Amino acid sequence: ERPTFYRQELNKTIWEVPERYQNLSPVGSGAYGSVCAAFDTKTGLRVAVKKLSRPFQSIIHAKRTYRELRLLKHMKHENVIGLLDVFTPARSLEEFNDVYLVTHLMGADLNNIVKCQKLTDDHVQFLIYQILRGLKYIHSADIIHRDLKPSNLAVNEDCELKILDFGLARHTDDEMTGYVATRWYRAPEIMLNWMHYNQTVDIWSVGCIMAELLTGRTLFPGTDHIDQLKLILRLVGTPGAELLKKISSESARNYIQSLTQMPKMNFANVFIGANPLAVDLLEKMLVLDSDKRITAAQALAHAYFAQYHDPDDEPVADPYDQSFESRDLLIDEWKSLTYDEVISFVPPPLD
C-alpha cells in the first residue's frame, strides 16, 4: 500500500524518499529546508523535492509547515505552483518528524530572463499578464504572496510563468538591510510598518517587476529603507493629508512629514519610449495609497493586455479556510494537523 522508501546522505542530511524519485541532485539549502532536483519515474517529470528542516521544532515552526502544506494543496492554477506530491517516511503519527514536498522542477527565473534576454513589449505584456492572472487566483482565496520578485517568478522557454516562493530562509532584519534585492520589490507600507497591509502589496511588487522588464533596470534600488523611500517618493510624489492620516505609526508618519514635498513625476519621461498603455498601467499600480492601487482583477481588463485577456479563462480559486491563522495550538496539534493533510494528499490527475 505504502511505496517503498530508500536512504541517501546528501550534504550530511539523510533523504528518505519513495523509489520513484531517482537521480537526486542538491539544488539549495537554507534554515527552513533543502531542495533536490529529481526524476519522477512514475510521471516522467523532472521534479524539485523540498525536505523541511526540523518541521516541528517550535510552535511557530510547526504552524509554518502546516501553513505551507495547506497553501500548496490549495493552489491549482496554470500560473501558480502546484503540489505534485507530499510524503513522509513515517508509518504512523508517533514516528512523524519529516516532511517532503514535490513540485515541477523550475529552472530559470525572470531574474535570469531580464538579465540575459532582450524583452519586447509583447514579451512584457505576456509576462505581466501571467503574473496578474496568477495573482487574481491567489488573491481571490485571500492569500497574499508578500514577496513577489523576479527570483520568485519561474519562466520556461515559451515565456510561460509560474508564481512560487523559492525562499528557504528565516526572513530576518539584517537580510532586509543594505543594498538588497530582498527589499527592492516591497510595498512601502510593508517595508516601513506603516499600517495593516492587504492584497495590494502584491500589485506594488508587480509594478516594480514590470518597470524592470521595460528598462532592464531595477526601479527602486535603495541602499537602505530610507534611501528606498526617497527613491519611491521622488517617482510617485510625497503623500498628502488623506494618506498621511491612514499611516497607523505616528512615529513613521512624523518622518514622512519631515520630507520636502514632491510632485508625482511624468512616468512617460521616466519610461522613455514605452507603450503609453504600459505607462498608464504603471501609474495605476505604483500608487502610494494601497486603497487606490489597481487590483489584479481590474488590471487583467486594462487595454495593455487586449491581446491576451480572456475573461472566460482567468479563474478564481476555491474557498480557502484560513481560520487556523487565528488559533493557538501546541506542536503536536500542528503536527497532527499536518499529518492528516499528508496522509490525505490526492495527486494531480497526471495532466
For the CB of residue 5, give the shortest distance to ligand L11 in the complex, in Å. 18
With CB under 6 A as the rule, give the number of residues binding ligand L11. 22
Phi, psi of 284 (to 5 degrees): -85, -10
Q: Residues with Cβ < 8 Å from 193, sequence gap 6 or more?
A: 249, 252
Nearest alpha-carbon partner for 303 in 284, 281, 327? 281
* Annotation: binding site for ATP: 27-35, 50
Asked if 165 is an active-site residue, the reply is yes
Residue closer to ligand L11 by CB (options 159, 279) is 159
Among positions 257-286, residues that touch ligand L11 (CB under 6 A) are none
Residue closer to ligand L11 by CB (options 22, 254) is 22
Q: Can you tell me which of 17, 18, 21, 35 binds ligand L11, judged by CB under 6 A?
A: 35
Looking up cell 512514475, which residue turns up? 42
Q: What angle, 0 to 180 degrees and rounded to 10, lies between the N-to-C axes of helices 201-215 and 276-285?
A: 150
Candidate segments 164-172, 203-211, 224-232, 246-254, binder of ligand L11 by CB under 6 A? 164-172
Q: Give dist(CA 315, CA 303) in Å, integer.
A: 19
Q: Residues with Cβ < 8 Å from 341, sequence gap 6 or more?
A: 66, 69, 70, 73, 86
Contact 332, 153 (CB under 8 A): no
36 makes contact with ligand L11 (CB under 6 A): no
For the CB of residue 216, give the shortest distance to ligand L11 in the complex, in Å. 24
For the CB of residue 146, give the shortest distance to ligand L11 in the complex, in Å. 8
Torsion of CA 217, 220, 222, 228, to 10 degrees: 170
Candidate segments 55-63, 87-95, 158-166, 271-279, binder of ligand L11 by CB under 6 A? 158-166
Q: For residue 350, which amino acid is it?
A: L
For the CB of residue 229, give the shortest distance to ligand L11 in the complex, in Å. 25
Cell matching residue 172:
530576518
Candidate segments 3-11, 101-109, 286-294, 316-324, binder of ligand L11 by CB under 6 A? 101-109
CA 212 centroid distance within chain? 17
DSSP state at residue 313: S
Residue closer to ligand L11 by CB (options 104, 183) is 104
Candidate segments 99-107, 282-290, 326-334, 339-347, binder of ligand L11 by CB under 6 A? 99-107
Nearest alpha-carbon partner for 215 in 264, 273, 160? 273
Q: Can you tell me which of 62, 99, 105, 287 binds ligand L11, judged by CB under 6 A?
A: 105
Residue closer to ligand L11 by CB (options 83, 210) is 83
Find residue 208's DSSP bridge partners: none
Looking up cell 491612514, which residue turns up? 246
Q: Give dist(CA 146, CA 152) in Å, integer.
A: 11
Q: Can you tell me which of 17, 119, 153, 163 binds ligand L11, judged by CB under 6 A?
A: 163
Q: Can you tell me which of 145, 149, 183, 293 binds ligand L11, judged by CB under 6 A?
A: 145
Q: Can you tell me which of 17, 106, 127, 206 binds ligand L11, judged by CB under 6 A?
A: 106
Among positions 37-96, residues that touch ligand L11 (CB under 6 A) are 48-50, 68, 71-72, 75, 80-81
Q: Give dist(CA 90, CA 43) in Å, integer.
A: 24
Q: Give dist(CA 263, CA 273) in Å, integer.
A: 22
Catalytic residue from among 165, 224, 280, 332: 165
* Annotation: binding site: 27-35, 50
For the CB of residue 188, give the shortest distance to ligand L11 in the complex, in Å. 20
Active site residues: 165
Q: Which residues bind ligand L11 (CB under 6 A)?
A: 27, 35, 48-50, 68, 71-72, 75, 80-81, 101, 103, 105-106, 138, 143, 145, 163-166
